[PDB]
Amino acid sequence: AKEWGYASHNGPDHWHELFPNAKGENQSPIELHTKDIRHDPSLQPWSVSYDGGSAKTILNNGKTCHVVFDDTYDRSMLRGGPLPGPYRLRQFHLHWGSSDDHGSEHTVDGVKYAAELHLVHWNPKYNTFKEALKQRDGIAVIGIFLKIGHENGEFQIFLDALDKIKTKGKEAPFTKFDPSSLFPASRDYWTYQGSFTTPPCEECIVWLLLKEPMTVSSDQMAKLRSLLSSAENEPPVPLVSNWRPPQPINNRVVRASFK
Ligand SMILES: [Zn+2]
Numbered sequence: 001a002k003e004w005g006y007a008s009h010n011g012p013d014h015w016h017e018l019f020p021n022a023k024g025e026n027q028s029p030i031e032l033h034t035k036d037i038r039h040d041p042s043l044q045p046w047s048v049s050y051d052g053g054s055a056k057t058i059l060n061n062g063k064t065c066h067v068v069f070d071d072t073y074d075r076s077m078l079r080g081g082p083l084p085g086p087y088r089l090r091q092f093h094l095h096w097g098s099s100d101d102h103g104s105e106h107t108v109d110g111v112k113y114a115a116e117l118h119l120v121h122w123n124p125k126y127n128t129f130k131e132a133l134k135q136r137d138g139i140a141v142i143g144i145f146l147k148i149g150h151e152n153g154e155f156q157i158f159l160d161a162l163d164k165i166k167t168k169g170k171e172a173p174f175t176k177f178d179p180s181s182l183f184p185a186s187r188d189y190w191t192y193q194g195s196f197t198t199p200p201c202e203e204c205i206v207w208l209l210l211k212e213p214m215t216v217s218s219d220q221m222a223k224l225r226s227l228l229s230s231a232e233n234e235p236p237v238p239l240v241s242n243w244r245p246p247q248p249i250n251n252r253v254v255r256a257s258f259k
Pocket of ligand 1: 093095118197
């Protein structure tokens with residue numbers, strides 16, 4: 001089946017061998033150059049209504065750790081911004097690096113953070129997460145950068161569950177958790193259209209990148225890259241890094257919601 005990873009043989013540069021989309025015009029991530037970004041005053045603020053009761057499970061597919069929500073009906077919503085309507089929250093996951101100096105996927109003015117958080121939502125108008133993947137506005141992603149600093153007690157809630165899913169395939173119950181408690185003070189954002197940063201890299205993403213990072217400690221970052229990519233019974237391979245290099249911007253325009 002689909003065979004990819006982040007190693008030198010199944011890494012980012014070889015993905016296009018098994019997945020064609022990896023060569024489209026609208027791939028992510030990209031690098032943000034504020035000098036080229038104008039403030040679009042037509043952009044409205046965004047808002048969420050998360051039902052912490054919609055959290056179901058936490059799993060380690062060996063590529064990253066996810067947190068799945070019940071998106072079979074309107075429970076945890078995201079609305080506003082450049083969104084044609086409200087979207088359902090499906091899940092979140094992290095990309096990180098080997099050290100605190102790098103790790104994010106998007107970079108601003110040449111600056112890379114320690115990690116990047118992705119909250120994936122989809123448009124109910126398209127009936128079906130699978131069917132939404134076929135539309136340029138099927139998915140909506142909140143992107144949160146992570147910088148090192150004081151320890152985040154909110155984010156810590158989530159980390160205490162990692163133990164239960166150390167290896168690939170693991171999966172455990174994870175309920176009553178509202179990811180909005182991680183959002184930073186400011187809600188100002190960049191926005192552009194792109195794709196998934198993992199195969200099959202569908203170009204169905206409207207991106208909402210926050211200008212302000214959430215802060216976390218190194219102890220917490222360390223915990224994150226202590227997860228294993230190998231299966232429960234296999235030579236333990238640490239999950240060191242799962243970020244994709246920045247792709248070509250092409251003719252895309254990245255709009256700002258702030259001045
Ligand atoms: Zn992602």
